[PDB]
Amino acid sequence: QVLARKWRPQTFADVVGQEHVLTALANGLSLGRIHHAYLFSGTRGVGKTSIARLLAKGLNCETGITATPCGVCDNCREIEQGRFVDLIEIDAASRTKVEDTRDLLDNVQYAPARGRFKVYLIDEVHMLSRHSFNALLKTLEEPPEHVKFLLATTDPQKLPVTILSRCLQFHLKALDVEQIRHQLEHILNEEHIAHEPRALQLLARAAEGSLRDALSLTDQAIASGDGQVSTQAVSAMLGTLDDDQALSLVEAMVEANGERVMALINEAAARGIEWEALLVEMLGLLHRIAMVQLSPAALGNDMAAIELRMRELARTIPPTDIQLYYQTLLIGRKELPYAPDRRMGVEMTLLRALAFHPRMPLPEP
Amino acid sequence: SYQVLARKWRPQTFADVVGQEHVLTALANGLSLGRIHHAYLFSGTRGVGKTSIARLLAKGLNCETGITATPCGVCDNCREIEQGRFVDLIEIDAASRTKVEDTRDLLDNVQYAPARGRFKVYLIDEVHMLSRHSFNALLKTLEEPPEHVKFLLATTDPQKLPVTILSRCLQFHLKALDVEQIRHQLEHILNEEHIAHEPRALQLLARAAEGSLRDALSLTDQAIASGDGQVSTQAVSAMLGTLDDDQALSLVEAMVEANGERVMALINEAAARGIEWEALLVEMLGLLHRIAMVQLSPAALGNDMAAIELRMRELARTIPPTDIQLYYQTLLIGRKELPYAPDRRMGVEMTLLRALAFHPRM
Amino acid sequence: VLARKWRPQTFADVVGQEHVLTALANGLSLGRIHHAYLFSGTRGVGKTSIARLLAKGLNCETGITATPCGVCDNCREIEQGRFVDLIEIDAASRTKVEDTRDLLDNVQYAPARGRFKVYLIDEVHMLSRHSFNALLKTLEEPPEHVKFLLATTDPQKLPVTILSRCLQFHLKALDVEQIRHQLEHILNEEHIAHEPRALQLLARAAEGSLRDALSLTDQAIASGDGQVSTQAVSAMLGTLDDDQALSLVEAMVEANGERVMALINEAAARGIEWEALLVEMLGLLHRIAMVQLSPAALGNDMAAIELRMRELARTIPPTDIQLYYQTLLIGRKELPYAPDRRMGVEMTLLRALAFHPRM
């Protein structure tokens, strides 16, 4: 089955990070101070849809209005299974039109069936026409006692300011690389699945903030790696080659050593690594170096296995020099498209390096 | 019942698919691990196996034999997928049916269980074309479909899809097909079709394909026509505007010698022979590459160049590394901006001109 | 909810907005009453709360007064929500003409409970072409017992032929203090702990809107488990920073490496499209550069950001500015080709902070 779906948190306990959101809602529920319009924003997969659902689920828990919904009363279990008569989840991206919104409006006045509240969770809410936005206005400003509105969207940017002044806005923050990792561990553990430590460090980086993105990558990682989430498997799928070879090329280049450079390229070519990619790990490395030079506490956590060496580079090579290599490889990337041959193109770009090399240029006639 | 090879030869079993072995692996692997997703996005450049594979992944999910990685192709199900006649791979031409109302219909008819098949499999192809709104429409469903539903997403340009869409898929970038990969195939196909071929001619086609199996089969079919039945080194090379080695180098040379009258007149002679201009530039770009390469280590000049080697080595000895880089770039750029200039010829002539006057430093 | 409970029932309870109240106060007082009034301005500054008030004052049992009592059957009936002769149409949900025509068939019949049949059409910019026409025909021959109250955020959308039939009051957005003093009052009343500088922070963050304000405050209370503390308020508002783009420009000029590496990292959390960050900065430098060519190039727009912008123009060499721009404008053209997009902005800002292009 599908990890992305199977692990959608079922209680606040199970929500990753977002303390600033969970912490308000719980504080507010137990405080009896509850709004009628809650808005949820953040980039894909950081938990908004699932948080919102937890809120509904906690608003209607037969045990009482609690931030710790019980997950066993008819109301909680039936919210879990998405078949709870009083949590009306509207796919705002298909109920976008006014007439559609008016229908949601008309059927508001009527009291809930089995719950303390009729809670409308309007997901992907940025899609509503202008028309159906203002439609929502007054009814969102002053609803009936038993009505609550859970809105949620990727970009709140699109909602009219009139809508905004009427809600609590909770902005879920994207996830730390650490956070993602820890979850990926827990889940692969719970799901009983072999995993190399570093393969997780790699996925959580590639997730670029999104706990779903990560679970989506893991899902296909598991398949790519054959029931194992192995480093080789993750870096295969990712276009990454495991870090040494990349740097070794930088080094050889700053060291003006041509033989080594071309050899190292030849060896990468034996591994049939895809050329643009290579270029990019090199720009990646140069950049982190040039950064390390700015703030020292700047060097990444993930590249311990190479920190010794990186640090050295940042220490020994002139900034104005790295600005050279970076730019040179960068317009090198700009070129690869049209170069005769993507290998040739990378090679040629490093040959360009060598000839303009700041410290030991190539020999002239 | 004739269909272009590029059509007739569409891989019908996972066995008959070229390269992309990482994709097929993960796939057959998942089916066999019972780890089947609901949203498969397939990406890569033109004609490398995107939609072909998607359709094969469909077969496997639906096969009368079971859910398999290795779909037979001999059941009412597989045969109907091969022919499109299969009721339960709703295959959408995204680039044609892009509007929301269009894809909201799609959504309404999802909830409904499949006809004579096991899974209802949508295959939105050319998907980068769905309106902004159409993407968002799918978000809620694509993330949480019905157990009996499977979404198959293929496109050339995944850049365009919303990251919200991407967050909800397994993505499989297909790699471009290796030159060899394309040739071995090409060979095979012409064999089975009972067409005569010369190996070096195959070599030229695989190159000109520029990564792409469809491109290849299309030039192949083109070959066969202008060849009168045969795919000959002669015919293919004349077709692709292929160079006789001398000509390129001579230019490269007349260019660094700063010899205007001769660069220009050399082109004039090329234009007469009807050379593919983009070809010339690439070959010079190729020559400029060795030259800069030989400067690095003398050994770097291949066994291939024996005929030239003499002229190559001089160019390498005389002209500064530095200065060659200029030459190479000026030509690359000119290849880039080639189709945009008034004639292709002119594009070349202007490129040589710009590069011409590099010669004396100060 | 704070926003709901603290809706002003007496004119006295209303914050600022005096140029509106007074003229109403006085027109009521001095027997001048137009058949129809239009209330505009920005989200949550009084528009409808005042519109309701004008109804109270129009029908008060004590007579047509500027100072409605808020204790008669009428004032509490309106305050409650169900007053026979207070017809408040949600123009935004009922905009088609069918519904406007049916609303105005009943306009003619005499008012059951009180002095005037008061129609309060709120969010009125939504009514169709045709629906406006209907209204119009009624505004051009207004029954005596009837008064119309139009409230909208966006007035420009009403036809000239209707704005030419209403006395229009543009409500001003609220002042930083105006909001703060109101925030103190309300928290005070509700019995809730607050700090001085916590509220100063919310009033600022409201960006002129008293609703934004209490909506922000409500949230703030939850972050604070019952206390509105600076410690908590500042954290929360940090959850919702637009900042980044300007904020980086600032730490850019000063040449603060950590502040930059940190903002870039804060922006990461907000979850930003990076190309868009550069563009906001670039835009930001543009504006500034031109505030350097007139005080006049700063928007009615700006305001919230504006203080920071002007200082920045004052204290950076115009030649330094065109420079920063170059560096950014460049880094943008390079963004696709930089390894990461993040990386490309980071690199651009280093370039801008510390380096100089020689050419």
């Binding site: - | - | 040449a255 100089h356 050419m359």
Partner: peptide
């Protein structure tokens, strides 16, 4: 303006160079 510095121009490779080392080195 070196001949190299000139070639870099022709190549689009923009040369960057310090200007405020102060906020670099020092953390």
């Amino acid at each position: 303006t070196s001949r190299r510095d000139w070639q870099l121009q022709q190549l689009g490779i923009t040369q960057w160079s310090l200007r405020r080392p102060g906020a670099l080195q020092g953390e």
